[PDB]
C-alpha cells in the first residue's frame, strides 16, 4: 500500500508499505529512497511520534495516510 511522508522541507515522498511493517522498517525505506539515517528520523502521525517496535497497523495507518518526518538536529 502507498502512504505519503512529508519531510522537514515539505517535500512529500511515496512509500510502498504493508500494515505489518514496523516503524523501524519504514525508516529503512526512507533511508534507501532519501538517504536519511534512521537515528535522525522522528516519524509522526496524527499528532504523536511513532514508536520503533510498533507497526503501521497498531496506529491504524491506511492507504494514502500522510506522515511527518521531522529530523533530530545536532550542532
Amino acid at each position: 500500500m502507498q502512504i505519503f511522508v512529508k519531510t522537514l522541507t515539505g517535500k512529500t515522498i511515496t512509500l510502498e508499505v504493508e500494515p505489518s511493517d514496523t516503524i523501524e522498517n519504514v525508516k529503512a525505506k526512507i533511508q534507501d529512497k532519501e538517504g536519511i539515517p534512521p537515528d535522525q528520523q522522528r516519524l509522526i502521525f496524527a499528532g504523536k511520534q511513532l514508536e520503533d517496535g510498533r507497526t503501521l497497523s497498531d496506529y491504524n495507518i491506511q492507504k494514502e495516510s500522510t506522515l511527518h518526518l521531522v529530523l533530530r538536529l545536532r550542532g
Binding site: 522537514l8 522541507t9 515539505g10 537515528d39 535522525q40 522522528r42 509522526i44 499528532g47 504523536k48 511520534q49 514508536e51 520503533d52 511527518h68 521531522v70 529530523l71 533530530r72 538536529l73 545536532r74 550542532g75
Partner: protein, 161 residues
C-alpha cells in the same frame, strides 16, 4: 509582512514545522559562534543572557540539566536517544558535547520561551524551520543550523523590528 506570513504546522503539541524559503541575511543578522562543540549553548546564551561571554554557555547547560530533570521523561525526542536520565545528563554535561533539538524543546519549556531552529541548505537559503513553543518569530530565540552540524545565533534585523 513576510515574517508574519509564515505557515506553521503543529506536528505534535508544542512543536511546529514550516518550510518557507529565503536568504537568512534578508531578515536576520547572524551572530557567529565558535566551533568548539558548544555552539548550540553559546547561541542560546547570546540571545538570552546579559553580558554574554565565551563562558556564559555553562549556565545554559546547567539550565538544560534542570530542564531535563523535569521534562526528559516526556520528551518525544528522548526516545531516539534511548538513555536513562542520569546517563543522558552525564553525556549532555560532557565537554564539547553537541546540543540539539532535544535540548531546544526542553529549554523552551524550562525558560518559558519559544525557540526556532532555522536549517539552511548547502545553498545557504533556509529550507525549513522547527519551532518549540507557541510564540511567533518576533518573540523567539532564533538559531541558525548550517552545514547540518553548526548553530549560530540570529537577531531580527532592525527594520522588521
Amino acid at each position: 509582512d513576510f515574517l508574519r506570513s509564515l505557515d506553521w504546522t503543529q506536528v505534535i503539541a508544542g512543536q511546529y514545522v514550516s518550510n518557507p524559503r529565503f536568504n537568512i541575511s534578508d531578515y536576520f543578522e547572524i551572530v557567529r559562534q565558535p566551533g568548539d562543540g558548544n555552539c548550540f549553548y553559546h547561541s542560546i546564551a547570546e540571545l538570552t543572557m546579559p553580558n554574554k561571554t565565551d563562558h556564559s554557555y555553562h549556565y545554559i547547560k546547567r539550565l538544560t540539566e534542570s530542564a531535563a530533570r523535569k521534562y526528559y521523561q516526556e520528551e518525544p525526542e528522548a526516545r531516539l536517544v534511548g538513555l536513562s536520565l542520569e546517563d543522558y545528563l552525564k553525556r549532555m554535561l560532557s565537554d564539547n558535547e553537541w546540543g540539539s533539538t532535544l535540548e531546544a524543546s526542553m529549554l523552551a519549556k524550562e525558560m518559558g520561551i519559544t525557540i526556532i531552529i532555522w536549517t539552511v541548505a548547502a545553498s545557504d537559503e533556509v529550507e525549513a524551520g522547527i519551532k518549540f513553543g507557541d510564540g511567533d518569530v518576533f518573540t523567539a530565540v532564533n538559531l541558525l543550523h548550517s552545514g547540518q552540524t553548526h548553530f549560530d545565533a540570529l537577531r531580527i534585523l532592525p527594520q522588521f523590528e
